[PDB]
Symmetry: D2
Subunit: 311 residues, 4 copies
Amino acid sequence: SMQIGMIGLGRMGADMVRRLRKGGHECVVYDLNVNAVQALEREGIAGARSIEEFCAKLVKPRVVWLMVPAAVVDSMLQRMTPLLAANDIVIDGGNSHYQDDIRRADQMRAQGITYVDVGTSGGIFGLERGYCLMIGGEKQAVERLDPVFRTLAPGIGAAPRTPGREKREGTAELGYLHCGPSGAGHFVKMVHNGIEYGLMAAYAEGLNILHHANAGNPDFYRYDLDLADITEVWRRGSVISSWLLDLSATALLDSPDLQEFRVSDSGEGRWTVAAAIDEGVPAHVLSSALYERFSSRGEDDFANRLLSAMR
Amino acid sequence: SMQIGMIGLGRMGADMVRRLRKGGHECVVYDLNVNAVQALEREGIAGARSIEEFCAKLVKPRVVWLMVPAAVVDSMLQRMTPLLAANDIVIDGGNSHYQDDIRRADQMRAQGITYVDVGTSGGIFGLERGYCLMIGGEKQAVERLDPVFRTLAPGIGAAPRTPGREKREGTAELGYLHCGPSGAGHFVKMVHNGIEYGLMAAYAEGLNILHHANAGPLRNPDFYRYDLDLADITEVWRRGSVISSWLLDLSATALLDSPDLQEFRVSDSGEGRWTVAAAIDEGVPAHVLSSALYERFSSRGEDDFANRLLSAMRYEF
Amino acid sequence: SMQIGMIGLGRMGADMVRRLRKGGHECVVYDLNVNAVQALEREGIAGARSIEEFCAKLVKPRVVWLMVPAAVVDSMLQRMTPLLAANDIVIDGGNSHYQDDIRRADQMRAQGITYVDVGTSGGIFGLERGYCLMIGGEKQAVERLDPVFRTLAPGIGAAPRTPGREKREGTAELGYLHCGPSGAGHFVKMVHNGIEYGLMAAYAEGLNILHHANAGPLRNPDFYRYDLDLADITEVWRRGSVISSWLLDLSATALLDSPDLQEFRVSDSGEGRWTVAAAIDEGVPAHVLSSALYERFSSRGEDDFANRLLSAMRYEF
Amino acid sequence: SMQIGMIGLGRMGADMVRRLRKGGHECVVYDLNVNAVQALEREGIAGARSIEEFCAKLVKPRVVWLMVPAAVVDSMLQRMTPLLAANDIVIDGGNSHYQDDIRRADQMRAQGITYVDVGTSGGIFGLERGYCLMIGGEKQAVERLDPVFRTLAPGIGAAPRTPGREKREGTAELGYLHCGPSGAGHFVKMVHNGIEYGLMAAYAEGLNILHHANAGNPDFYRYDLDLADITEVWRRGSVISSWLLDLSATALLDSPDLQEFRVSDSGEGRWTVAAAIDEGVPAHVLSSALYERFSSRGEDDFANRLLSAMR
């Protein structure tokens, strides 16, 4: 059992505070936005009206968790570090690029503060089922953080054991993993999202082929397929069953033609392709998934006009 | 409870018979390869030494399941159809292209025989876990076949129910589905395989990026000095991440067994190609399905000539 | 100097007749649409008001060129073949799929008629500049046709000679080529079009990147504040760069005329699809040809359903 | 007529000095490598044995052209700037990324020195036919540089005029172009190369389909095509005629099976895709061209083994 300060009280920050506390830890929360801080006080969680009070309320060695917008992080660290102390641990659990972690961890180390990066997967489902956690930073900090990660993670019961897993040690089976030195956590999280784009694109394209199976040799394209039912049937016994398939089946059940649904993207997909390119790794599928999101917003438009022009 | 004849006694055919039997049905089997029939006979399943005895042993109306190579199907139909009778049902459960089911179904119907296409997924795991079944053909025949599909399929218990399914009926929740008229089962199974290629390619490419995270051209080598444990990472993704799936479970198992996969050219069996062909005909964008297929092609060196041409152009300019 | 009958009097057919005539050949033309024949008759080219008079007017052995829609070809052959004679030659110069040339060539040969496929490139520019011609079919017929191809093609003068060509003969340097037996001309023209899609997509995507260079997510907006002049840039690339080409010349002309292309959904006519189908059958990786095709599909919104599904998944998780 | 210092005497640097001088300009050359400097002295071109002498020999306002490896540029500028003077112009004609130009131009401006970026196209052919030039930087510098660019560029005679080009002014028709402020030159050069990859990939894939047209319904794939002849025929009257096609036809003439030819890549292709991703522009074709080069070196290998594994 530990005391954890949380800065950044959006949905994720607030949900992680709820899970941590429900798991027996003590939380102090802070946010530039007083209504946000006050929402959590209404739930019995200690607040703080400034970064000075927040640091005052946390006993040394401190553990500070950040769930703020990426572009807010450096300013956050600047405002706070002068009240922090050697042996403190600061964790950035947000959507920061791993090269920023490497620089940040360096600056904090110059003041005896250990900076830990955490890539978080699970979104709104994490509250009850736990979050998948990809952790970068110094071993000592990460080991001291163990009780926090155990509460946050799903625990081994979240899935059948992999045959032979008893041959290995570490925490991989619990749903959280120390991936490496500073940055490694966000680096693995980035690629996670890149892969996620690819998986979604593969289902999407495939179902689009089914959706057009009535295009009608028109005689070979006169199928009126039931996509809701087809995705449902794939959940059992097929090679392509997955959480993403489960979600597709749910949506399609509600709305067989998705008529109440332009796809945005948040960065990790983009950063994944950039890392592929730096490393010289072929990334056709991951990049095309990304580009499909761009074109879905009409960013292909000017290329299309030139095509019409030439022709 | 039913009598089912099974032709084609390779791993898949043998396994469905074992599952069929174990689930209370009566099977008679046959294969051009006698060693194969005998092996099932040793298991105490009724055999047959010729197409003739096979048809003879099946009481009318017959139910005949084919698990032969795609290339052997038409000649299996030429050979046995003269012994079959109106109201018999023939099922092709192998990897046939749906356009062939359409033609075949028409031929057989002219003889009062109902031709049913089944795309089956699940492979070696189907014996114990049930096969996902995608079924095309006439409604009457598919309804007659319901007990065989129920036995073969996983059953609702195999996965938690989709919020709202109590609002719907049909068999989808059991792991089998009548997809449409003739060809529809193989059409849907084809796309399932195309999707499967795309899914495997996404994992593979991403894991390849992680694998190269120690690459440290290269502007900041310090940004690429991670020695990542791919076995652990795939394991950790199985709980709480957006990308858990059966394919991940398999990747984790393979990487646990071989962290460098050093004992391992990727083949492709056709359904991936057929899927892209359907996409092209339909005017459906298929970047990722196609690219996953093409990666298999280049993995066999089929890009070699394009590559030499690029090197040569470079030499030229 | 030869007599050539031409059926199909759209822009392309009319232009080849004009070029043919202007180059000293005798043309007789015909089209199901009388207004079209008359228009050429006004130009003082011999017409015909029926398939019958058409064949009647052509001295045996005949040379008959088709420039009709692909979909009209077989019925044009059914209709006129009973009036034709052994040792006649029929040329299909339109956009037929090569597998159809193979079948058609076989049918016609059974009547002593030689069927020749010509893939023609160059479009509206062919009249003054000559058409690139890719020719499939029997050697004897193609040799008999040499004077017609010479007239139709650009001639060696149209581009500087490739260092070493004096080491080789044949007609390639003239802008026409006997590519192989029946279907080979259309096979090669098909891939030419596939390549053309890839080339246009490369320019378009790159110009789109330049077009967005003022985008200033976005880590350093100062790194994207270029307002680039795409008309000037394409113009400057025409001299001294690695990427000058006819397609660039066209891009430059379009952008000069319309820097924002504001008066401009991309269609595709089939050869691009057929090219990817050939690639798939052959096991050839085709990432860029396919992606250029798929971009045309999504430009028509055919991705819409895949997109809604992604939005919905996002909503779900 | 002007005096131009050249630093970096590889093939391009040396070739540009030959073209400049053949065009009436005066050149002083320098290189860390004395044999390189001496090769050019053997041809009657003034050398310099150090960066101090080089700067000494150049009359103010100076014009310094750099053709050094990208990774050498900043060190070059550091060693040299203390001997330079306000009103001097420094040009980086090499393969530098445009964001470096923006930073560099800033630092040089703080000392009254104008920094010009030039993207050069044409390689070994530029000596005789002139180089295509994409120029970024301050208008005043670029205008003062005009006589140098005119000598280097092909001149309008290199190609038929675009109908209506008389409606516009500027130098685009001469083969060189002021593209914008600092970086714009290298930015346009980068995308040039990205496009080049795409064009080469399109021909390569297409010819590979022809090459496999004898794969044999095997009856539909029994064509033995003559690729040398086919590329030759496409040079006249087709839609796809191009310099790149001209080069393909030459190579194939020599070696119909390319048996005496793993494809490397130099960076601009990579940087092009990164810019696409930052801008949210779909880049399927350009990226796949790049990834084909990566896989041609076997970088796909580990992904392929995993595919075999799962299956």
